[PDB]
Amino acid sequence: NQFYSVEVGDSTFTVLKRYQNLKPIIVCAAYDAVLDRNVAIKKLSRPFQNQTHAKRAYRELVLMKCVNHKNIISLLNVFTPQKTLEEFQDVYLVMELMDANLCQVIQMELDHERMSYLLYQMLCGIKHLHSAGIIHRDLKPSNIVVKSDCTLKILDFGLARTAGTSFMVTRYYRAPEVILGMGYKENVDIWSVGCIMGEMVRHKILFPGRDYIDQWNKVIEQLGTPCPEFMKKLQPTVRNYVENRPKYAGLTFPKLFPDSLFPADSEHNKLKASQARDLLSKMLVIDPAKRISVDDALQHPYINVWYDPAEVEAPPPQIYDKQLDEREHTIEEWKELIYKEVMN
Ligand SMILES: Cc1nc[nH]c1-c1ccnc(Nc2ccc(N3CCOCC3)cc2)c1
Ligand SMILES: CCCCCCCCCCCC[N+](C)(C)CCCS(=O)(=O)O
Ligand SMILES: [Cl-]
């Protein structure tokens, strides 16, 4: 038998014998005896509960294989313990083992070298995805991982374009045009980056709330009521609720992100506080027509210190299935497509 089973964190992992000493991080850490290095193993158990699960799994598999960028998690191995298509049930993804999730990194005291470097790498990864027509729309700290040396990888790719701005849990990083069903462009992801950056400074979620209604209130209370230039791009119906909200001037960026939150008492620190706030003021913009692009954010003085064309300006991923986002299939058909990807 090529496999063995172990209970980890109250789930069954049936894995190739090369993977040893499984530990909870449905994901675990393992030691790979063949490569002599640690790995993360993710079990896809219920990827055929339905078509949404199946599409997500297939898309996750195909994209993780095809994309090769240092800021996007890459696949080391894929396997199934089952021997035939008929018995096929579980899919295991094996990837490089990182040290922490960005959620835990956000909690550390703000350091400009680290924050700028993390943001730079996020921007690099997003740029690469965008070049291949991959616009994430649900970027969040829990799906970004880091190593102890601050190298960063994005864990996921968001939904197919055919999902638009619908996601049918953590909603706090979604852009206004997503929340309000306005349609999106590449810079939808820049809002999420802004939310993450802001949280690195405040150590509090910027726009929390039990639902979108609550979240929209937190947006307008802090950034102000959006302009008629924005209101006019809304459908009439949605606009009524948004127009009938209490008017807010919004707080200035110096009040949202006061000097008190930033390292003090050097001219370098004073400079960086100002630059960090400036970049925030350009990312946390409600109207996506007025919000900074990824490419312009990489030129911003806060970020551009890291800029290396050899990292930033890689060729785009060419995608083999041109209808990856659009085509729909039965469960039986998705299951076979996935199975083929797993067996190659
Ligand atoms: C595929 C996948 N899905 C979610 N996460 C991952 C993943 C992928 C690769 N590496 C890691 N490394 C990692 C290791 C330890 C931690 N923690 C530290 C302390 O306890 C809280 C978390 C976080 C991440 C995680
Ligand atoms: C806090 C209030 C929440 C209001 C929820 C608003 C409901 C939005 C539904 C209208 C859809 C309009 N179109 C343009 C057809 C969507 C394009 C596709 S997509 O935007 O990319 O999904
Ligand atoms: Cl093995």
Swiss-Prot record:
It comes from the Eukaryota. Transmembrane segments: none annotated. It catalyses: L-seryl-[protein] + ATP = O-phospho-L-seryl-[protein] + ADP + H(+); L-threonyl-[protein] + ATP = O-phospho-L-threonyl-[protein] + ADP + H(+). GO terms for biological process: cellular senescence; Fc-epsilon receptor signaling pathway; JNK cascade; protein phosphorylation; regulation of circadian rhythm; response to light stimulus; rhythmic process; signal transduction. Its EC number is 2.7.11.24. ATP binds at residue 42. One of its GO terms (molecular function) is MAP kinase kinase activity. The TXY motif contains the threonine and tyrosine residues whose phosphorylation activates the MAP kinases. This is Mitogen-activated protein kinase 10. The gene is MAPK10. The chain holds residues 46 to 400 of 464 of the full protein.
